[PDB]
Amino acid sequence: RVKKVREMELIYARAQLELEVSKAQQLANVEAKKFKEMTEALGPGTIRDLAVAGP
Amino acid sequence: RVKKVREMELIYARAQLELEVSKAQQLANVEAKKFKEMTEALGPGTIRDLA
């Protein structure tokens, strides 16, 4: 009884595994290429001065 | 009973995954190219002096 249900919690957790995996995976692709285009369209010297706004 | 509903919470979370993904994805495109045009139309020396 316990073997079968928990070997199934095995397969169910394999499932929930992949869900959380690709969840955060493509959320990561989202925010990472977000800030990719952010800073690439910014430019090296532009963001350097924007952050070095201090004498 | 638990297998089927939670393998479905698998597919539903795959769904909610992609929702949050492209949500923040295109919000990111939004704010990033926002500040892209901001600082590019500003110019290097302009923003340097402004800061």
Add this chain to the structure above:
Amino acid sequence: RVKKVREMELIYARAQLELEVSKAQQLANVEAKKFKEMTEALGPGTIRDLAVAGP
């Protein structure tokens, strides 16, 4: 009685093992390649200045 149920908790924990394994495994792939693309699209000097925002 105890042997059989707990040798099964063996196989069930082998299962729960692999669930937690690939859970954190692909969550790791998620966040790691997230910050991969983050900092790679950033660039060496860009992130250096963004963090060296201080005189």
